[PDB]
From a paper:
Murine Polyomavirus (MuPyV) is a double-stranded DNA virus that can induce tumors in newborn animals. Viral attachment is mediated by the major capsid protein, VP1, which forms pentameric capsomers that assemble into the T = 7d icosahedral capsid of the virus. Sialylated oligosaccharide receptors are engaged in a shallow groove on top of VP1 formed by loop structures on the protein surface, similar to other polyomaviruses. The differences among the three strains have been mapped to amino acid variations at two positions, 91 and 296, within the receptor-binding region of VP1.
MuPyV found in feral mice has the VP1 sequence of PTA, but the virus is controlled by an intact immune system.
Residue numbers in the entry:
A (entry chain E), C (entry chain B), D (entry chain C): 33 to 109, 116 to 316
B (entry chain A): 33 to 109, 115 to 316
E (entry chain D): 34 to 316
């Protein structure tokens, strides 16, 4: 159904669905143990640095990846399709960053006093709602970065060849789809503006090392998903795709300034309506 | 109860109510004595730091908590009526007090112990809500290993009767509560729950950092509309109106080992309500 | 007249009045001599600090206070009242902060070179227009602060009793009216949102120690004073009240980092119309 | 032309005029030689500081002044007058601040390495369009400042008397008109909000010492000059007055941190229409 | 040229897309990641003046304008016809792609813990410059420099001297109307020299912003939901002369800083354009 017709009316013609996507900062959800690694859930493991200009081998659990979920919608089948009309979305838990009583690098390092330095630095917030996987365009800081072959999907996973210098700019060969949760690094894979005809995405980036994190939250804000012609994302095979990443910055430890990324979960409440298509 | 009909007209069909909620930064309102602890009212007590990666036990009087009040509305009740909250004028009062730079805080010139008394700076957090039932809360913490006190505060373990788990550092749907007591629910634990709160409107913002300048605006000319996309405001169950807030401006820092004290300010609410026919 | 009726028409039914309010930062307008203290006019005197946690005695001339003026309107008397419809207001003189050639603490303290550090830090801008004095609510940093009994109006002035711990939050007992220029400290007295039914006020605060000052100015911006029912402040006994404070930050001297508050004057042009009342 | 009537229609009833105003930061346009001082054109000369609290004698070529031009409109003469309807204005050249390869104070002063520090600090942008000279109100940081008598127009030029302490706040005696380019210091002379009935002005100030400069530029933005009654500035004797100042901050040299103000030129394109007047 | 009605019928509206890669200083070739290709997307190390009178920046340290000319379908069989058709640019969706890549703080840049050579690899920070333009002819440029004494290379960059055949004059540090050019070549016009000319560009829309400083956090937004309208105050978009559509941009994110003498390299990001065009009758 490529030709969009009238809205469907009658019993059950509109539905609301909700979901939360937890962040994928590097430590997986398991093991759950708060001694054996689970204490880092919601965070990355300690960022490991390159050893030379030609030896940059980041560990998978130090690389934040995209969150995604595919939600199955009520069975439907001139055919009908589910059309995503609007979304209320919220990043939850910023108040938790008011914990300045922990064991991070303290504000008075001479005397080991003050407060536990709160999360600060680079921030990245993107969400998307669509009727098929988010289309991704690869672009990296360094085409020489030696990403692991297993456990992450990177440009080489797709091309079966090493990255080239064009991958540090826009190389149309380096494309993928966001089809797995916690696998696609956000430092590699960006929303592709040349595709995503059936997805809406919204992103912002704020960089720096000690930048104050900023966040707003309210249950009163609706994001309209209709395009310029009044048509929202159309859900292929009754599948709805949610994608996001919400990085708040890093915490810094008392030992060699080890940094850990902090991510927060995102709530989605999507309103959908049935649409006649041909 | 559930089905929303026409607006009620006639004598006393609209009312305005006002309240102020004082901040709950850690030191309680009593003792009142300015030498026995009352001098910290409006502030937290000095923030105490973890002693290791596995030993983090913050004292309750160092943890800002939610402010809340339940206000009783005029009695009501062929068919039923409910009070509907239409709009609110809200204001955080007292930012001018932060222009006191003549006190005994850590001074700006630490070479000569001179300059000015460093004003309140750092992390800031402002949330308010108005609803017809308690604000629904979702728990989420920095560290599921934090040893919150088991007395005098409501934490995740209070609700679940079990220790926190690693999922409590992200979204764990088991870890939920209702904001039903003033000065009891820490803001570093309990967040507005976007999966509930159908009958409350909430508005929040967070700005982090350690030395960030505090910013605030105030005017008596701004109205916040509380009507939803269908033109319906919060409906007050059992004629109860719930106000919730927290307004953290940052910390002051003392001259002794950089002890930080949170500063909070009071929030004014003036709520306009109308009677609604319901079925 | 509590009941508001129709607008009055005919000759001289609309009037426009203008005024400027000079800042009240601590040094009075006199003595005028530029060697006897007049050189500090527009500024506070050097901020003096507490000597202990229990001994905080700020000098009056170090405390910025509210500016205010009561303007008399044309005689009038179903009666008529003057109704304030709108105001054009502007803070004048921000360009003067571009003087970085004076004798302030220099930007290179190592060598005593560079430029004279410009005014920076905490900023506070409030104005109000009303038909009666601005209603004030007291709230202080420290209820133990030992304000002078003479020369400033403080909480103790009103209550005849020492401040209490509730005065560090909202204590409804601690209220006053802005009825005198250069007397009510801005670190004590705030617009009262529980009153001021017949006044409109607009305030903003930006804190910190070295924060860059920011200001906009134009003669093209009108502030509407009408409430949600289309009614502006009604001038009791044909008196119009103007209130403000405009703090730009501090300058810092070359001697023990002594700080002086800087304030700027505010212009008001108020449009008023006659209103029938009963 | 006190009473404003209908718009004039017919051939040549609307006109557009354009101009650029170069900045007046302190070094005059001549000498042109890049070894005789011409290399400082667009900049001030090195800011010279006071030698004590009572000895502040800034050199004229260290003080940015207002730019202005009077443009002659087509001859006209119930009479007709030119009415300025709107202006498109832009500050040109912010990209030049991306030169970080010069000999300014370097970013690493420990090793004398890094990049040439770009222009930073206090910024001031004002423009005005009017039918007569911009009305100015004097206000200074320090009434004791010993401005040169020749080569700048200062408060003493107007009053024939030394500045008074009231000149540090609003002194209504201290007024002038912007009638000469490169002569009225911006640290003294501000748009007068109590006059300028026939001019629109728009100003902003951002202070500090190392503040990042910010600028936007586009050819798609129109500033409407009509007042609340739908009347723009009326050009007396067919003269159109343009006034501006656009300070981007300072560069800092490698010798004693000497600062030089940087200004940029401003483009104006003004649309005017003929108006019947009586 | 007099602008008449919109043309209707099959194929009267079209959308075209393009990406422009940044031109920060290292050219796209050599492609080898050991011979210079590893710097593509970046400048080479910024080299500094050696005195107040000796400022000779290398070409590969100077970011230049990106541009592309797109050729649209021919509309007019006979240009002597009284009424003709032109392509009119109505709107553009534009996006700067790849800000997420700046979240790589695991490389070999100057580290944040300089005592121990630990912490994180300092991310890109500092001065930022974002400009894009869409027009029916080349972007008109106005020259203006920091220093008229700067000794730009004569070969490899188009500078004021390239145009005038004479050394820069002191007026080139402000607005000198003699110092004008057109953006007619990609990767050649330095952005520290050449600015959109507000006195021309009647048939182009440009949008620019500058944020300065040395350690300023970079900020960027991106969405596929934002349309930039290109119609002027009369409802007319850029009209494509000889069916040529010109895209111009620069998108500087700041610098990375190396572990060797704090050497800085500019970082740029590519820009996507999707332009909606419609046929317009003209005479």
């Amino acid at each position: 159904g490529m030709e969009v017709l009238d809205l469907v009316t009658g019993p059950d013609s509109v539905t609301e669905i909700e979901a939360f996507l937890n962040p994928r900062m590097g430590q997986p959800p398991t093991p759950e143990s708060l001694t054996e690694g689970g204490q880092y859930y919601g965070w990355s493991r300690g960022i490991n640095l390159a050893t030379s200009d030609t030896e940059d081998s980041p560990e998978n659990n130090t690389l934040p990846t995209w969150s995604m979920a595919k939600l199955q919608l009520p069975m439907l089948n001139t055919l009908q399709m589910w059309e995503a009309v609007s979304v209320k979305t919220e990043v939850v838990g910023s108040g938790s960053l008011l914990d300045v009583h922990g064991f991070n690098k303290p504000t008075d390092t001479v005397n080991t006093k003050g407060i536990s330095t709160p999360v600060e630095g680079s921030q990245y917030h993107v969400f998307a709602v669509g009727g098929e996987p988010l289309d991704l365009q690869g672009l990296v800081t360094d085409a020489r970065t030696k990403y692991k072959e297993e456990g992450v999907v990177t440009i080489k996973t797709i091309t079966k060849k090493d990255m080239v210098n064009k991958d540090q700019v826009l190389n149309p060969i380096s494309k993928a789809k966001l089809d797995k949760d916690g696998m696609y690094p956000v430092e590699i894979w960006h929303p592709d503006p040349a595709k995503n005809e059936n997805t809406r995405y919204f992103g912002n980036y704020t960089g720096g090392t000690t930048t104050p994190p900023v966040l707003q939250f309210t249950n009163t804000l609706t994001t309209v998903l209709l395009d310029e012609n009044g048509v929202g994302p159309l859900c292929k095979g009754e599948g709805l795709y949610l994608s996001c990443v919400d990085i708040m910055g890093w915490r810094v430890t008392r030992n060699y300034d080890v940094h850990h990324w902090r991510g927060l979960p995102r709530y989605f409440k999507i309103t959908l309506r049935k649409r006649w298509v041909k």
